[PDB]
Amino acid sequence: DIEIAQAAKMKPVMELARGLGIQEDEVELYGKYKAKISLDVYRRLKDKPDGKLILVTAITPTPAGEGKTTTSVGLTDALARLGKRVMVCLREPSLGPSFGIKGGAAGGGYAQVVPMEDINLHFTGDIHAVTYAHNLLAAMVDNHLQQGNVLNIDPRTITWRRVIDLNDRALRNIVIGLGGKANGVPRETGFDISVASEVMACLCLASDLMDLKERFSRIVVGYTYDGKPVTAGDLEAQGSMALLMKDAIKPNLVQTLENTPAFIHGGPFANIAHGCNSIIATKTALKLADYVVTEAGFGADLGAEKFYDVKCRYAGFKPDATVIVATVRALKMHGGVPKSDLATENLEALREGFANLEKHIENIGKFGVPAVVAINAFPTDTEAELNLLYELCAKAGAEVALSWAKGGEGGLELARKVLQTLESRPSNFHVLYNLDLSIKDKIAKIATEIYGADGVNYTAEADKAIQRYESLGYGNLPVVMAKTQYSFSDDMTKLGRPRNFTITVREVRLSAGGRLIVPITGAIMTMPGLPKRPAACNIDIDADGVITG
Amino acid sequence: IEIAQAAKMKPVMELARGLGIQEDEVELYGKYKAKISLDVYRRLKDKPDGKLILVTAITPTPAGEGKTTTSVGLTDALARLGKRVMVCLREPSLGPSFGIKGGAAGGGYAQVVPMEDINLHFTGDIHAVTYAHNLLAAMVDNHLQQGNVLNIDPRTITWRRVIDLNDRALRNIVIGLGGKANGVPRETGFDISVASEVMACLCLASDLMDLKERFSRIVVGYTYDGKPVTAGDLEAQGSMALLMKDAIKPNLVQTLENTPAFIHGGPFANIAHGCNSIIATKTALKLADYVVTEAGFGADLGAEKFYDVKCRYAGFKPDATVIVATVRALKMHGGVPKSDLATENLEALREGFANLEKHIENIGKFGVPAVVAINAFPTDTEAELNLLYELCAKAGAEVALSWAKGGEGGLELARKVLQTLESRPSNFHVLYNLDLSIKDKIAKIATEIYGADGVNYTAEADKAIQRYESLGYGNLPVVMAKTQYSFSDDMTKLGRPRNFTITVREVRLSAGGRLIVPITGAIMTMPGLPKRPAACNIDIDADGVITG
Amino acid sequence: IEIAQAAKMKPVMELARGLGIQEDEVELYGKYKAKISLDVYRRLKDKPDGKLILVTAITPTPAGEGKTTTSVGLTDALARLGKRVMVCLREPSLGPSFGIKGGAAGGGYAQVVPMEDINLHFTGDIHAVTYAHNLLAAMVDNHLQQGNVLNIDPRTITWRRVIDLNDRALRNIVIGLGGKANGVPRETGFDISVASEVMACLCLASDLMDLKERFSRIVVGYTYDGKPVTAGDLEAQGSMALLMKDAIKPNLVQTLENTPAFIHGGPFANIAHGCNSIIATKTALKLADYVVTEAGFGADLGAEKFYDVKCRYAGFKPDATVIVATVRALKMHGGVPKSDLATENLEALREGFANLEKHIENIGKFGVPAVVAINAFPTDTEAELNLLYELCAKAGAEVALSWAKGGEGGLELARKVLQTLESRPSNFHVLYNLDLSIKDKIAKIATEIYGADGVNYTAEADKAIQRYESLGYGNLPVVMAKTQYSFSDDMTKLGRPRNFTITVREVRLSAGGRLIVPITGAIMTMPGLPKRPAACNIDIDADGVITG
Ligand SMILES: [K+]
């Protein structure tokens, strides 16, 4: 009944593949339980329609828990139990978190995909290809200078950093090229955490190997002494990179605890990226199944938004429904209660925190998709609470998910009401904004309509960029708001449903292998720090079995 | 084209069976690559080993060596006569594939396959070492952030970071910049990933429990008192050990002639012994009658080291040894330039012979047989060859045209190898001892093997040794870090230099292994991409590779 | 040419006599420059002071200010009528002389001489501050080298180094690189030398024993606990005090009209009060009936500061005050561009007047008289002037054409200054108090003086204050570090902006003085040479200067 102590019996993925429609020649085994499926599978099944796409998201997250994936998986396993042909598409966790603050499984209890240990570590080697595909560009950028600098790059203008998959602050700000005319040119850079690499973003949005290789060449490394952009294409590097991503362009097949098939592929930041998994693992899921569940980072103001305005936008996807997660406790926090006394009944705070849930319901409504709530179960929650939380959902179908405890069975209810709105309430999907708007215009819609904010404030730095950009052609791309996820505002302290406030964007970045980033506060945290007490200081594989994963 | 050599492989799952391996003791990576578990060895603990055939070579040159190919052709030749044999080789760094290009996994009809997977991600063995090396560092730098609880002096940290690409840029850098919330500023840099110690330990550990132990011996730096700290002191070993949980397993593959190839690990042959893994071969030893391995650089290092290093720890006993040498290679040793190798010559063939001839002598000195080998070549007319033939008046000496005659070419030699590994018995003893003074150890290595009449140590050198021995790391082996293109450090003294001397400028202690004594500027622990990188020329069709 | 103004000076040794100074209380530096000892003041401790005539000005613009000249013309005018008076000015940084060029020591027939010596080495007053600032740092960095005996966290050191040149290069750098024998790596940088605190303290110390004391209060940084360390904590003050032993003496000189000029010290008017030395003037006060000084920037800072700063500590009481303003200057305040100042205009002359008019109001607020002053100009036709004339309906208001009429020009004003410093008496009180909350102090400064309706503080700002007050440095004055080209921080809101607000991003505590609250990016504590440096154009004939 403890998570890691729950890695028992799984069927060979080949068997799972055959049973989905995969041929032997479209599978590349990684042990009896991991497979890389050729992009041919999909390529040959493009004329068949898609199943029903179900996006699961949640309310503004707090340090008081919530649990998105647990539900993502349980819902699946439940749909599977009800006789449905389904799959689950998920992101691959970063290596770093496993040693810093320990690595939890994909969801948990009896709601998780396996093999665990392998998915938190090296899995199928996707993050390394991404780690080197990327780091090779850095290297190639540097070499060019070293070799006379023909393209004419002001090193001091190099925006494309380096990257690694652990947590090293010490790598945040650094100086390179020291030594002499024989060691390159001196400059200031640093490392981010792989998953934050723009290379990981393209992976999760690219069509196939050739669309990938193209984006890779549209990537801006730095600028000339004239301001003119020098791109990765200019360095003739898209060729090599792609080749480093040759095997990483294939989804990875692996199942749940209960043997439902699942796709783990990709996984970026949901503030500096759409925070969704690869589009390819999903579009493949849509053809091999009748129901596809996938989740999206942070709250519904972020992952949700970006899922629709980026992912679905690029792939012509059209969601059929959206399950939204909420807990009794994390709702009473938004209601005002402290983290300390969260276990104590208080229908008031409960009812005031609802405002958080209420807004998301509505927002999810501005996208034209029928929402369904999933009150994640909990020991201390009472009836005088859950009950109020149901009648409080005067809008969308509500239902409790004992998915954690009772495997697919606790998600049975949730499954039945999804199929329910899935049958009577067909979706009318439309992105929140048109691409032919101004950048400050799209930024408002998102913060005016989704964050429920009054308006937006920009800093001089913010302006200058939002224009070197526009006038430079990248003005009609999607906008990826990078703010704090702990609120509908850029102040991580304004819990619940903050009214009468303004967003303040202070810097704006570009991801030519996608679109326009735009951080608010220090949402730049692109490289976490190992806590004073290293979860690694206690990690120790035995002569056979690990301990402290 | 030698990459067009891609053709006809046999499921590894089968071969493992065709060697006797419980399926449950094999993890795949596609149908033609597969990791074998440590339970194989451990379950065949006492069974009979086999014959060792370490194939070293002359003293490298720009004419064309043959360290690898000739090692495989001797497998497609050896086994090609109903013989239970394998090949224990080394995995090539990724970086070089975009710098100067990727070469044959061995050479001609010997190169292990698939070629690509070996020269790239492979079974992701590197990345494990990588992430294990950098996590240690990560913990080092993080620690200081906490309060340098161990009173460590950032300026003494000798533990670098590591990347498997060719980047001059990362060689000398400053990190930890930013302010009380970014960490402590100190200087460091990056070394190529294969030049890692966390790589050596890999090639020289008993098992995934031996590894978890070494690591904890590895020195990150010292305190403000000169008191050595270690990864152990940081409780990393555990974590570290896990990042390696799978890389610790050898890798199975075949040849174009489907012979059971074992490619696991691979370090530097100056700072490191240049031997493939000790677990892959020791496993190989059971799984077959014979085992065709190979060490780093000219027999004056890889060889001299392979012995004192690998064999020592693993109690091995090289029932034989080889040593290649082309015709053109020795002429340069005769003063013959690279542009002056086309023309036949014999007055140089004999002087430049002194080269091949010297190693022969040292080979014997370890108490093991020996045999000559000649990479047959189009310009190697009869005249030239004929002379070489005889000169080898001291032990076996055949011609192996494996490069273009598959196993057939290596036929002649294969017989002679069994021929001498049958009549000529060997009693293995390490040319030196673990108790001699750290200097007397390098000593005996400069004398007999290299050919010097003495070894000097600078101000810097004297202190380190003394520091080490005063600390205890004095009863360790010794890994010569000298150049190689010459028995001596003078990368110019070609052939067989005489009367010289060796001077050991510095000395770096490798806790998880031994003592690295550098003679020249062999600190090029990070190669550099050129003005024409294969990266600017590499692309991948909507189907497959080009210019790989 | 205004440098050709070099002509006819009177031995300083004499002037000192023609003011009553014991020869033994005068050190020379040539016949026309001379340091006066602190014994002068100290020996005339109780004698009668005199009248203070702090000449401030409008709010700076690219049209032409007049902070200086007008200050001297009022001396060549004032004393030009048998009056015991001097001029207490500021010494210009060296650096600027090779960057954008060296300008008149005041302007026209007012500029103190010799011009060159003032804009160069002078009496080497800077270099003393310089070597005193950098020695502290030197000791800071050295200390850590010893064992950071004080458990100091290098990342908290706020004590920069300093050079008197315009170098962008030295702004942000890393030092202490090299290894356990070169020192500890940390980040820092260089600020211009005059922007030193070791300069402020100079202009605001009682005597060479007051100085030796302040210094020891100056914060270098904190320990790993947040525990403030100081130069005192390093036992530097002594040494430091000595490097200054001679700079602590004011400097005597004259005018083209030989009037007793006193040029000693000179800091920044944002991070610092921009006042000349407190010892030079307090000395001047005795040595004469009147004293014509001058403060930094527009009267909203130098002035507002001069008061709260200088006068406060030294118990002074500005028996009067002035404030220049050209005709063209106010029109820009009327929206009139720099290329649109040639044409007469009066509808702007009145709106842009709001500027001059506001300061007038604040001036009064400190409890001291006031008078207007207009730098007469060739394009300042009658029409324009006439309007200005009247508008000043609130107190004295004359025209001073000193620039080209020597003391004669400043005649009109000179009379009116005595005229009002005779009928209009002043009771001096600092616009604020030393006990009010550090915020309420900036508050009252933004309100009345600048003209804001409130002051904001960021996350960063709130902590610092709170940190400081929790440490005790809360009962100090407050030096506004806002831009100046506008009553507010908006370097664009010209004339007299209304309804706005001020936001104080950061707060740097200056132990040897006060609190520096920055509003904008006024951290340009190091100017930068341009693409056409006067250095590339400066040469010196086999005899004398050209392009100086
Ligand atoms: K992956």
Curated annotation (Swiss-Prot), chains B, C:
For the ligand (ATP), the binding residues are 61-68
Look up the EC number in the record and give it: 6.3.4.3
Which NCBIfam families does the protein's record reference? PRK13505.1
Q: Which InterPro entries does this chain map to?
A: Formate_THF_ligase, Formate_THF_ligase_CS, P-loop_NTPase
- CDD domains listed in its UniProt record: FTHFS (cd00477)
Does ATP-binding count among this protein's keywords? yes
Q: Which SUPFAM superfamilies match?
A: P-loop containing nucleoside triphosphate hydrolases
Q: Which GO terms describe its molecular function?
A: ATP binding; formate-tetrahydrofolate ligase activity
Per UniProt, what is the name of the gene that codes for the protein in this document? fhs
Keywords from the UniProt entry: ATP-binding, Ligase, Nucleotide-binding, One-carbon metabolism
Reactions accelerated catalytically = (6S)-5,6,7,8-tetrahydrofolate + formate + ATP = (6R)-10-formyltetrahydrofolate + ADP + phosphate
Q: What is this protein called?
A: Formate--tetrahydrofolate ligase
Q: How does it assemble?
A: Homotetramer.
* Anything else known: Binding of monovalent cations contributes to thermal stability.
Question: What does the entry give for GO biological process?
Answer: tetrahydrofolate interconversion
Question: Is Ligase among this UniProt entry's keywords?
Answer: yes
